[PDB]
Amino acid sequence: KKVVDPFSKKDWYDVKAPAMFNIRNIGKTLVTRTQGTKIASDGLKGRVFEVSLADLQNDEVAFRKFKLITEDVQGKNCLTNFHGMDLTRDKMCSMVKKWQTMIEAHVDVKTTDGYLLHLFCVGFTKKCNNQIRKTSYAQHQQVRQIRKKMMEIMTREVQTNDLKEVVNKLIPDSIGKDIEKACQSIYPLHDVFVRKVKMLKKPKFELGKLMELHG
Amino acid sequence: SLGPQVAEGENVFGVCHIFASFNDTFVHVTDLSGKETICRVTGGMKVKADRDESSPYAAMLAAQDVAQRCKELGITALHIKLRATGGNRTKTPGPGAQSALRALARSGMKIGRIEDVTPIPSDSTRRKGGRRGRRL
Amino acid sequence: TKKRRNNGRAKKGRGHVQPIRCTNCACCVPKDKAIKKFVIRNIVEAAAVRDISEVSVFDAYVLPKLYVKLHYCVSCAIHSKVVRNRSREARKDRTPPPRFRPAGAAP
C-alpha cells in the first residue's frame, strides 16, 4: 500500500581520505536520517569504499586500489583509514605470461602501531636481451633463495614503521625497487610488486592517531 | 530526487555493478559502500518471453529505467563493476552487459574506472552435472 | 590404424595428468589433450569507448582488460570451428598463423 520512498529521507556525507594521500575528497554517500531509534552514524561507521590509487594520487597508479574504511563521523564528515591494497584483475592477469616463472612470497607481520598485516609480493623471470632460448625459467634453487629475499625485506620493511609509513612506502613503490636490488644478483626478474596487503588484526581504537592522520 | 550538493563541476558518486549472464542482465547502482541500494531493474522486467530475458535491447531498456532514478534521486555519476556468472560457471560476459553500459553512458550519467569482478576460483568444487559432458 | 603419432595431444613421459572441464560441455579431458585459447578483450568494446571516454571524468583514463583462458574438449572446439579437419598432410603442422593481426579492420 503506497509508502515511504526512501531517498526522500536520506542524508549525505562526504568521504574523507587519510593524509598521506593527495587529494582527499573521495566522493559522497547516503544514509537514513538518524532517528533515536537509530544512529545514522551506526549504518555509516564500518563502511568500506574501495578507491583507485590513481584517483587518490593522481596516477601511473591505474592498477592498484586502496580500501578506505569509515572510522568516525563528524557532521557530514567521515574520516576513513587504510584497510588494504589490491591490484584489480586486468593488471594481474596481464603480467602472467607463459614461458616465464611466476614467483610469489607473502609474509604476515605486526607493525609499530599494532596492526597485523599479511602482505604479498610477486615477480616474473625475464629473458635478457641477447637470450635465444625462447623461455626463461628460473631454477628451483633460484626461487627458493629469491623468495627468502622478498620475505626478509617485507618483514624488515613493515616491522619498523606504522600503517602510515607502509602507506607512504607503497605509493612510490620503494619496496619494489628494493627487491629488484636484492634479487638481480640471483636471477633477472621483470615486474615485481607488493601486490596486495591484508589487514588481519586492528589495534584498539584511539581517535588520536586517526585525527593525526586526518584533520 | 534531491542531491548531495550543487557542484557545477564534480559529480556525486555511486557504484554501477552489472551482472551479465545468459538468460538475463542485472543493472544496479548502490552507495559506494554498497550497504545501501539505489534503483535496480533487470533486463527481464522490460520485455516478456523468457527467451528474450537477456537480449541487449532489453538491457538497454533496463539501463534506461535505472539511469532515470539514478539521476532522479541524486547520483550524478557512477563507477562500474561488470560481472559474469562466474564460479565454475562460464567465466565469459553475457550479451546485454555491453548494451547496458552503452545505454547509461549514452544516457548521460558519468563514468569512472572499471574493473571486472566475476568470481574466479583457485579452482574446484566439481562443475555441474557430470563427466561425459552435457551431451547435446 | 593409428592416426596421430601424438595420439591425443602431447603426453610422452607421463602416463598421467589432471583433467580439465570443457568450457562448453563441461566435459572432461586431460589438460595435455584439450584445445586452449587465451581471450583478452577490453571492458568496453568497439563502439562504447567514445561515450565511455566522454561520459567519464578522468583525463583519458585508459581501459582495463578482461582476461580468460578457455579450454575446450575435442567435440566443442570442432563443433564451433575453433579448429577444423585438416588433410592427412596439413594435420602435421603444429604452427601458427593469419596475415594481419585483426584488431579492428579484419573479418
Next chain:
Amino acid sequence: RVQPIKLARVTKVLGRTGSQGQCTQVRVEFMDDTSRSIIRNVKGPVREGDVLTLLESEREARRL
C-alpha cells in the same frame, strides 16, 4: 527509457547476407553529423547515396 528518429545516408555497399541472401550490408554517413559512421542491415534493394531511417541508433550489426 527511450525515443528519437535518425536519418543516415549510404556510404558503401558491403555485400550480401542472410542465408537466403536477401539482406544487404551497408555503411552509413550519419546525415545530421558526418563525424559518425556505422554498419546496418537492409530489407530492400539499396544503392549508394540513398537514405535509411534508423530507429535504434546504436547497435551496429553483423551476421545472423
Next chain:
Amino acid sequence: MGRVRTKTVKKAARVIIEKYYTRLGNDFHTNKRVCEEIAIIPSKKLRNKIAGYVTHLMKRIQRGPVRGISIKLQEEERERRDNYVPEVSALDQEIIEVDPDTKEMLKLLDFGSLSNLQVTQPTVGM
C-alpha cells in the same frame, strides 16, 4: 562473365602478336583487316573475336609488358634499359667501417685495408 575468351582464341592472339607486333595496332578495325592478310581463319565471327582480343592485348602491351608475350622490339628495349651504372655506389666513401672480427678477418688474412671499429653485443636466438 559470360564472355570469357577460350584458348583457341587467346592462343591466336599470343600467336599473331609474337610474329606481328610492328604490323598490328591499337585499333580493332585494322587488325581485323590484318588477320585476313596474315592468317587463315574459317568463320568471320572467330576472326573478329581473335582481332578483338589481340587488340585488347596490344592496348595492354602498349602500357606495360604483359606476362607471357615477347616480340623482337620489346627484347631490344629491355636490352638497352638493362645497361645502367652510375658514379657508382659502392664507394664506399673513404674508409670501410668494419664490425671488427671482420677486422680480425682481414688482420688474420694478411690484408692491409681501410678501417673502423664498432662490433659489440650478444645476442639472442629466436
Next chain:
RNA sequence: CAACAAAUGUUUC
C-alpha cells in the same frame, strides 16, 4: 560469438 530433430519396409537379378 556460441548452439540445434527424425521410424519401417516385396523376387531371380
Next chain:
RNA sequence: CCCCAUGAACGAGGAAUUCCCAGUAAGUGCGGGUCAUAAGCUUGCGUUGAUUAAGUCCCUGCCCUUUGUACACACCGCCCG
C-alpha cells in the same frame, strides 16, 4: 452444332504443391496435327502485357575439394536384447 426449356455446385480454396526474370508471368483470340464427322487436347503463332530477385546455397537436386565410413545390389546401405 443450334433453339427453347430445366438454371447445380461454386460467393476465393486446408494439409500440400508447380512454374517462372522480359515480349517474361498472366489475359486474349487464331492456325496446324488428329480428322468422314468430332477439341475441353497437344502444338505453335500474333495481340494486350505487368508485379518481382538481380541474387544466394537455406531447403531441395547435382557435381568440386578436404574428411569419415563395419557402406560397395553402394543410406532406399550395413544394428542390440
Next chain:
RNA sequence: CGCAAGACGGACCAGAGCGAAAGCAUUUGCCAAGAAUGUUUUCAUUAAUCAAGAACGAAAGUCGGAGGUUCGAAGACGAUCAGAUACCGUCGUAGUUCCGACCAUAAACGAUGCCGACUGGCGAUGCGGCGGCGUUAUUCCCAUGACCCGCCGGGCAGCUUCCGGGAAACCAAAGUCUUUGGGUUCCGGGGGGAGUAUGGUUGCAAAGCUGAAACUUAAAGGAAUUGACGGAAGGGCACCACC
C-alpha cells in the same frame, strides 16, 4: 559486510619434470629415499633375465568411523517423442573427500618384454660437468649471478632422410631376419561356442585366477585403393532449388 564447514590447489603450466608402474603441482620444517654427473676413490666377476614365491597397483564396489561442501550410479519429478524407463530440466541417493582393513582389475596403450652391442643427419629443452683476451648486471677490484657461443654425458621427445625394415599405415627402431643363429622371459596356431562349463584356488561380498568340450561355420580379420554417401569442414552451381 563478516563468519563457519567441507572441497581443491586455477592463471603461471610446456610434444616440460620425477617416479618401477599405478601415479605426482600452495607455503615451510623434519624424515629417510631415487637417478644423472663429476670422480687418476673402493671390490675383483660381484653379473644378464627369470617357473615357483612376493612388493606395489587409477576407478568403482565392500567393512567400520569421521564427513557429506561440491557434484552426484538409484529413485521421484518437467519437458520432448508415435513410444522415452533416456539424452534435456529439477529434486536427489549410495558415492565423491578422509582413516584402518578388503579387492587385484582398467583401449593399466608407447596396444610395441627386459638386457647388450652395432648402423644417420640437424636443431630444441630439463640436468650435470668442462672451456671463452663473448655480452650485460657491482664497489676501488672482486667472489658473485643470469646470458651468448662450443664441447661431452645420460632424459622425454621432435624434425628431415629411396641405409634398412614392414603387407602397408608406418618404423633410427618395428634397423642389423632366407645372406634366417647376442642373452633371456612370456603368449598365439581360422572364426564363433567362451573367459563359457567343470574341478581347484583366492575373496566377507561383488567377483578374480587357471580353463575345456559337444556343436557351429568358409571366412573371421588386417592394410591400403577407390567411389557411393554424410543431420563432418571449405566448397559450389540451377527459379526442373530458394529468394
